[PDB]
Design an enzyme around this catalytic site. Structure first.
Site, PDB file in Angstrom:
ATOM      1  N   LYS A   1      10.963  -4.853 -32.977  1.00  0.00           N
ATOM      2  CA  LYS A   1      11.813  -3.671 -32.513  1.00  0.00           C
ATOM      3  C   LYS A   1      13.007  -4.068 -31.705  1.00  0.00           C
ATOM      4  O   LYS A   1      12.711  -5.184 -31.179  1.00  0.00           O
ATOM      5  CB  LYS A   1      11.168  -2.545 -31.955  1.00  0.00           C
ATOM      6  CG  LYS A   1      10.461  -2.916 -30.449  1.00  0.00           C
ATOM      7  CD  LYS A   1      10.057  -1.951 -29.692  1.00  0.00           C
ATOM      8  CE  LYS A   1      11.090  -0.661 -29.489  1.00  0.00           C
ATOM      9  NZ  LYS A   1      11.885  -1.050 -28.618  1.00  0.00           N
TER      10      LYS A   1
ATOM     11  N   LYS B   1      13.648 -10.451 -29.526  1.00  0.00           N
ATOM     12  CA  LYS B   1      13.760 -11.241 -30.458  1.00  0.00           C
ATOM     13  C   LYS B   1      14.806 -12.627 -30.115  1.00  0.00           C
ATOM     14  O   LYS B   1      14.625 -13.611 -30.469  1.00  0.00           O
ATOM     15  CB  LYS B   1      14.178 -10.564 -31.806  1.00  0.00           C
ATOM     16  CG  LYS B   1      13.340  -9.721 -32.262  1.00  0.00           C
ATOM     17  CD  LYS B   1      13.700  -8.939 -33.448  1.00  0.00           C
ATOM     18  CE  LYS B   1      14.909  -8.235 -33.299  1.00  0.00           C
ATOM     19  NZ  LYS B   1      14.817  -6.981 -32.142  1.00  0.00           N
TER      20      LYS B   1
ATOM     21  N   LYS C   1      23.923  -6.337 -33.527  1.00  0.00           N
ATOM     22  CA  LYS C   1      24.154  -6.485 -32.091  1.00  0.00           C
ATOM     23  C   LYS C   1      25.145  -7.759 -31.785  1.00  0.00           C
ATOM     24  O   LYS C   1      25.749  -7.953 -31.020  1.00  0.00           O
ATOM     25  CB  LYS C   1      22.935  -6.314 -31.095  1.00  0.00           C
ATOM     26  CG  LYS C   1      23.332  -6.539 -29.702  1.00  0.00           C
ATOM     27  CD  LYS C   1      21.951  -5.815 -28.827  1.00  0.00           C
ATOM     28  CE  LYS C   1      22.154  -6.054 -27.172  1.00  0.00           C
ATOM     29  NZ  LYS C   1      21.939  -7.363 -26.776  1.00  0.00           N
TER      30      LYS C   1
ATOM     31  N   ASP D   1      13.857  -2.301 -36.694  1.00  0.00           N
ATOM     32  CA  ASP D   1      13.461  -0.905 -36.385  1.00  0.00           C
ATOM     33  C   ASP D   1      13.365  -0.361 -37.606  1.00  0.00           C
ATOM     34  O   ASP D   1      12.700   0.768 -37.774  1.00  0.00           O
ATOM     35  CB  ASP D   1      14.485  -0.344 -35.403  1.00  0.00           C
ATOM     36  CG  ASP D   1      14.531  -1.170 -34.191  1.00  0.00           C
ATOM     37  OD1 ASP D   1      14.116  -0.919 -33.284  1.00  0.00           O
ATOM     38  OD2 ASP D   1      15.605  -1.768 -34.147  1.00  0.00           O
TER      39      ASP D   1
HETATM   40  N1  LIG Z   1       9.985 -13.090 -21.488  1.00  0.00           N
HETATM   41  C1  LIG Z   1      10.902 -12.330 -20.778  1.00  0.00           C
HETATM   42  N2  LIG Z   1      10.907 -12.152 -19.524  1.00  0.00           N
HETATM   43  C2  LIG Z   1      12.127 -11.492 -18.927  1.00  0.00           C
HETATM   44  N3  LIG Z   1      13.112 -10.992 -19.579  1.00  0.00           N
HETATM   45  C3  LIG Z   1      13.118 -11.072 -20.988  1.00  0.00           C
HETATM   46  C4  LIG Z   1      12.023 -11.763 -21.581  1.00  0.00           C
HETATM   47  N4  LIG Z   1      12.202 -11.455 -22.911  1.00  0.00           N
HETATM   48  C5  LIG Z   1      13.516 -10.898 -23.190  1.00  0.00           C
HETATM   49  N5  LIG Z   1      13.896 -10.706 -21.931  1.00  0.00           N
HETATM   50  C6  LIG Z   1      15.145  -9.941 -21.841  1.00  0.00           C
HETATM   51  O1  LIG Z   1      14.831  -8.636 -22.453  1.00  0.00           O
HETATM   52  C7  LIG Z   1      16.188  -8.369 -22.901  1.00  0.00           C
HETATM   53  C8  LIG Z   1      16.129  -7.810 -24.288  1.00  0.00           C
HETATM   54  O2  LIG Z   1      15.928  -9.201 -24.949  1.00  0.00           O
HETATM   55  P1  LIG Z   1      16.401  -9.717 -26.417  1.00  0.00           P
HETATM   56  O3  LIG Z   1      16.222 -11.023 -26.922  1.00  0.00           O
HETATM   57  O4  LIG Z   1      17.992  -9.417 -26.458  1.00  0.00           O
HETATM   58  O5  LIG Z   1      15.928  -8.503 -27.550  1.00  0.00           O
HETATM   59  P2  LIG Z   1      16.272  -8.112 -28.863  1.00  0.00           P
HETATM   60  O6  LIG Z   1      17.003  -9.270 -29.581  1.00  0.00           O
HETATM   61  O7  LIG Z   1      14.810  -8.043 -29.455  1.00  0.00           O
HETATM   62  O8  LIG Z   1      17.000  -6.948 -29.175  1.00  0.00           O
HETATM   63  C9  LIG Z   1      17.242  -9.431 -22.632  1.00  0.00           C
HETATM   64  O9  LIG Z   1      17.857  -8.798 -21.238  1.00  0.00           O
HETATM   65  C10 LIG Z   1      16.246 -10.488 -22.221  1.00  0.00           C
HETATM   66  O10 LIG Z   1      16.996 -11.138 -21.076  1.00  0.00           O
HETATM   67 MG   LIG Z   2      18.743  -9.564 -30.183  1.00  0.00          MG
END
Ligand SMILES: Nc1ncnc2c1ncn2[C@@H]1O[C@H](COP(=O)(O)OP(=O)(O)O)[C@@H](O)[C@H]1O
Ligand SMILES: [Mg+2]
Ligand SMILES: Nc1ncnc2c1ncn2[C@@H]1O[C@H](COP(=O)(O)OP(=O)(O)O)[C@@H](O)[C@H]1O
Ligand code: SF4
Ligand code: SF4
Ligand SMILES: [Mg+2]
Lengths: 273, 273
Positions: free
Chosen positions: A10, A15, A41, A129
């Protein structure tokens, strides 16, 4: 051969952070990797490229005229560890199908010979999603044989994992797309590892790694880096190295068994989440 | 007249919890309300109906033959406070467009006279991770004049708010769909209220209410109720009553000003999130 992997989950679950750190660890190990961003994104490669983001195939095709006026060497960009990076892009909100750019991008990469034999892994970072349009194409069209789902003890994240699994089952009669594992990206909750292990067992897969919540991620990302590059000695760097090792060694690729809503709620009730 | 409102936001941010509690508070006040679920998760009415979920128009049409074999009195169900409830449904993952059921549902409701003059409000609870297909239809086809976006200090939740706003701008030349406000559903972070106020000001709207994180929500939902019904004396019940009052009194409906990624990052950096 190369291993074609897709990371689903999600929105906001981790990811892109998990994929880029995993891939940096693979590059650090000596593997040749390409990341294909399949999320509108379009920031799935910025930590490898030290960048704000990356201009997308949809954007570059529009400025060049057609996607045929693009050259692969103009579109693919190399960053940390020589990892190659590309972003699909997608239409603006309210216009057309959000996943249409994924179809254009993967077809362009295949036609232009991006899948050179020397690659060891390709990772697609895919919005999960909804499982339709271009977001379903890596599964429907047999592009990613190994699906890894990032989730957490959050009910919505587990629901998304179950939904993605239903899509894998739907296309199991053709091609060879399989669920490879769940990756728990922790919300610092009690028994969360046990909860995701239990969910994986019900689906027929495994929890390949439990990634802790660690603020070093934010400090690295503010500086446009993976933790692997930003602080190779960090405890969190070793976590991503452990995840990479287990992905490399993983041999369990299954047609999953999606569960009912009652099963998910029982999991949550049981583990006191 | 009736006020047609849509609640958008990223998955798991609190759309359905906020909508059902807001609507319960409106019913408690004496308003007549209908909720239309426009999220494939299809659990947007369960707290009003005291139910697991609700069978969807897509499911019921398939069992009856065609959507024309359905009667409105068979599809709409009344729960707490007389609130009327309906679920769109959608295709299974990997099959067709995830939002297709929303188009079928809204058209069915309009044709069958569900929008009777005695209604005061209609709320659509809409998936917002992509803005396309049936999920864009409430905006594109002028079904919901007042859009309220649930978000939080989470970057992904703010990105989603900006994306939904871009969709509103896209269709501002026709119909009368406008952004009515942001609702901050707290993650218990410091200065989160200030952060969402700042984002709303940049978009040209307001933060209509800050909803605290409160475990009473889970205790009510385990029992399939809104907090309003479960514990009318709860502090969180008064929070939802305050949100409902401000929605009733709100007169600011704008064509928003979407911001750049640099603006979002600066907001996050500034408020130390
Ligand atoms: N293990 C973790 N510890 C701390 N922050 C995290 C961790 N994994 C992800 N984040 C933070 O969560 C937010 C969303 O992560 P992201 O990889 O961009 O999600 P997605 O790609 O699934 O939308 C980012 O700001 C990232 O820095
Ligand atoms: Mg992403
Ligand atoms: N203010 C709150 N305090 C505590 N828990 C909340 C709050 N708002 C939402 N939740 C919980 O968050 C989860 C997701 O909320 P939900 O309304 O289902 O999200 P969405 O409809 O946006 O996917 C639910 O388990 C819900 O109980
Ligand atoms: S969901 Fe996006 S276009 Fe079908
Ligand atoms: S995104 Fe779902 S079908 Fe277009
Ligand atoms: Mg919901």
């Amino acid at each position: 051969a190369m291993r074609q992997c897709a990371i689903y989950g999600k929105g906001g679950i981790g990811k892109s952070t998990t994929t880029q750190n995993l891939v940096a660890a693979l590059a650090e190990m000596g593997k040749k990797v390409m990341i294909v961003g399949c999320d509108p994104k379009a920031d799935s490669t910025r930590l490898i490229l030290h960048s704000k983001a990356q201009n997308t195939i949809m954007e570059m095709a529009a400025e060049a005229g057609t996607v045929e006026d693009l050259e692969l060497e103009d579109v693919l960009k190399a960053g940390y560890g020589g990892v190659k990076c590309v972003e699909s892009g997608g239409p603006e909100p309210g216009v057309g199908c959000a996943g249409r750019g994924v179809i254009t991008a993967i077809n362009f990469l295949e036609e232009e010979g991006a899948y050179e034999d020397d690659l060891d892994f390709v990772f697609y970072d895919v919005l999960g999603d909804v499982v339709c349009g271009g977001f379903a194409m890596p599964i429907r069209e047999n592009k990613a044989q190994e699906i890894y789902i990032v989730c957490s003890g959050e009910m919505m994240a587990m629901y998304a994992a179950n939904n993605i699994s239903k899509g894998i089952v739907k296309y199991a009669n053709s091609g060879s797309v399989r669920l490879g594992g769940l990756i728990c990206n922790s919300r610092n909750t009690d028994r969360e590892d046990e909860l995701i292990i239990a969910l994986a067992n019900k689906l027929g897969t495994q929890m390949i790694h439990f990634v802790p919540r660690d603020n070093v991620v934010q400090r690295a990302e503010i500086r446009r880096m993976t933790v692997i590059e930003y602080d190779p000695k960090a405890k969190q760097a070793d976590e991503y190295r452990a995840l990479a090792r287990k992905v490399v060694d993983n041999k369990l690729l299954v047609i999953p068994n999606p569960i009912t809503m009652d099963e998910l709620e029982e999991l949550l009730m049981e583990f006191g989440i």
